[PDB]
Design an enzyme around this catalytic site. Structure first.
Site, PDB file in Angstrom:
ATOM      1  N   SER A  91     -11.294  11.674  -4.368  1.00  0.00           N
ATOM      2  CA  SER A  91     -11.033  11.302  -2.976  1.00  0.00           C
ATOM      3  C   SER A  91      -9.632  11.012  -3.205  1.00  0.00           C
ATOM      4  O   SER A  91      -8.841  10.976  -4.324  1.00  0.00           O
ATOM      5  CB  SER A  91     -11.630  10.120  -2.540  1.00  0.00           C
ATOM      6  OG  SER A  91     -11.373   8.830  -3.189  1.00  0.00           O
TER       7      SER A  91
ATOM      8  N   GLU B 243       0.678  -1.383  -0.055  1.00  0.00           N
ATOM      9  CA  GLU B 243       0.115  -0.040   0.061  1.00  0.00           C
ATOM     10  C   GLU B 243       0.953   0.960  -0.110  1.00  0.00           C
ATOM     11  O   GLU B 243       0.605   2.211  -0.956  1.00  0.00           O
ATOM     12  CB  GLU B 243      -0.984   0.123   1.158  1.00  0.00           C
ATOM     13  CG  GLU B 243      -2.106  -1.043   0.935  1.00  0.00           C
ATOM     14  CD  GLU B 243      -3.291  -0.521   0.070  1.00  0.00           C
ATOM     15  OE1 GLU B 243      -3.179   0.582  -0.533  1.00  0.00           O
ATOM     16  OE2 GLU B 243      -3.880  -1.511  -0.546  1.00  0.00           O
TER      17      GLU B 243
ATOM     18  N   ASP C  47      -6.073   8.680  -0.801  1.00  0.00           N
ATOM     19  CA  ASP C  47      -5.576   7.547   0.199  1.00  0.00           C
ATOM     20  C   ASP C  47      -4.606   8.109   0.889  1.00  0.00           C
ATOM     21  O   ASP C  47      -3.825   8.803   0.376  1.00  0.00           O
ATOM     22  CB  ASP C  47      -5.488   6.289  -0.175  1.00  0.00           C
ATOM     23  CG  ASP C  47      -6.566   5.504  -1.466  1.00  0.00           C
ATOM     24  OD1 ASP C  47      -7.668   6.118  -1.021  1.00  0.00           O
ATOM     25  OD2 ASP C  47      -6.285   4.759  -2.108  1.00  0.00           O
TER      26      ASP C  47
ATOM     27  N   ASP D 103     -11.891   9.459  -8.785  1.00  0.00           N
ATOM     28  CA  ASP D 103     -13.174  10.127  -8.424  1.00  0.00           C
ATOM     29  C   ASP D 103     -13.120  11.590  -7.419  1.00  0.00           C
ATOM     30  O   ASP D 103     -14.029  12.147  -7.135  1.00  0.00           O
ATOM     31  CB  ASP D 103     -13.994   9.175  -7.456  1.00  0.00           C
ATOM     32  CG  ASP D 103     -13.403   8.531  -6.273  1.00  0.00           C
ATOM     33  OD1 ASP D 103     -12.055   8.879  -6.013  1.00  0.00           O
ATOM     34  OD2 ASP D 103     -13.986   7.849  -5.447  1.00  0.00           O
TER      35      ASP D 103
ATOM     36  N   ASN E  65      -9.017   5.724   2.633  1.00  0.00           N
ATOM     37  CA  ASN E  65      -9.512   6.583   1.871  1.00  0.00           C
ATOM     38  C   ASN E  65     -10.430   7.762   2.363  1.00  0.00           C
ATOM     39  O   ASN E  65     -11.175   7.464   3.364  1.00  0.00           O
ATOM     40  CB  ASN E  65     -10.264   5.763   0.750  1.00  0.00           C
ATOM     41  CG  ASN E  65     -10.819   6.544  -0.368  1.00  0.00           C
ATOM     42  OD1 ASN E  65     -11.233   7.803  -0.290  1.00  0.00           O
ATOM     43  ND2 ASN E  65     -10.870   5.883  -1.471  1.00  0.00           N
TER      44      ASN E  65
ATOM     45  N   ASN F  60      -7.209   9.392  -6.366  1.00  0.00           N
ATOM     46  CA  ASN F  60      -8.189   8.375  -6.939  1.00  0.00           C
ATOM     47  C   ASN F  60      -8.738   9.132  -7.992  1.00  0.00           C
ATOM     48  O   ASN F  60      -9.040  10.526  -8.027  1.00  0.00           O
ATOM     49  CB  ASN F  60      -9.103   7.640  -6.179  1.00  0.00           C
ATOM     50  CG  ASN F  60      -8.391   6.692  -4.988  1.00  0.00           C
ATOM     51  OD1 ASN F  60      -7.604   6.038  -5.254  1.00  0.00           O
ATOM     52  ND2 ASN F  60      -8.577   7.030  -3.689  1.00  0.00           N
TER      53      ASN F  60
END
Ligand SMILES: C[C@@H](O)CN1CCN(CC(=O)O)CCN(CC(=O)O)CCN(CC(=O)O)CC1
Ligand SMILES: C[C@@H](O)CN1CCN(CC(=O)O)CCN(CC(=O)O)CCN(CC(=O)O)CC1
Ligand SMILES: [Cl-]
Ligand SMILES: [Cl-]
Ligand SMILES: [Cl-]
Ligand SMILES: [Gd]
Ligand code: NA
Length: 128
Positions: free
Chosen positions: A50, A35, A52, A48, A59, A46
């Site tokens: 958002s 990760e 992380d 959309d 998220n 991301n």
């Protein structure tokens, strides 16, 4: 902070993450490697809109507040910035909620594709 393998295992284990919802300590160190590469400051945008945050790439859509994810939830009740600390407390308490929520460690795409069904115990091998 960039964590060593053994150093992150001992910290996760002291924060109670070991066998949490039946997931052995090797599954968690596994996830963090793929990760973040053990890096508390990792961010990834991301498509959309958002983002992380931190060692387990939590998220901003559901779990914390970064002030730029419109009509999103903050179910950990924390700023996203807190998930970037050398102190992994915030990230661990926040992961305890996510992994409990119905889908287990499948919430982590790098866990599903690179750790699930592998020898995860290998990730804590040698550490005291
Ligand atoms: C402990 C040593 O392994 C240190 N190490 C020596 C070099 N190794 C040789 C080898 O792994 O036998 C090859 C390169 N290595 C590949 C890999 O490990 O998958 C990536 C770098 N590693 C990352 C890490 O190991 O955490 C740090 C340097
Ligand atoms: C050359 C070796 O480094 C080969 N290596 C297997 C043996 N490693 C060696 C070690 O790290 O001492 C121990 C197990 N290892 C833990 C970890 O390394 O983080 C996870 C699996 N690794 C993943 C990776 O390297 O990225 C596969 C390749
Ligand atoms: Cl394990
Ligand atoms: Cl927001
Ligand atoms: Cl589960
Ligand atoms: Gd390795
Ligand atoms: Na949010």
């Amino acid at each position: 902070k960039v964590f060593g393998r053994c150093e992150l295992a001992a910290a996760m284990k002291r924060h109670g993450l070991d066998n949490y919802r039946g997931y052995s300590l090797g599954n968690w160190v596994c996830a963090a490697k793929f990760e973040s590469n053990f890096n508390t400051q990792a961010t990834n945008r991301n498509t959309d809109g958002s983002t992380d945050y931190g060692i387990l790439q939590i998220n901003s859509r559901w779990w914390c507040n970064d002030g730029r994810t419109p009509g999103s939830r903050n179910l950990c009740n924390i700023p996203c910035s807190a998930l970037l600390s050398s102190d992994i407390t915030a990230s661990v308490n926040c992961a305890k909620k996510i992994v409990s929520d119905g889908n287990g460690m499948n919430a982590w795409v790098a866990w599903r594709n690179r750790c699930k069904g592998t020898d995860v115990q290998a990730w804590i091998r040698g550490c005291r």
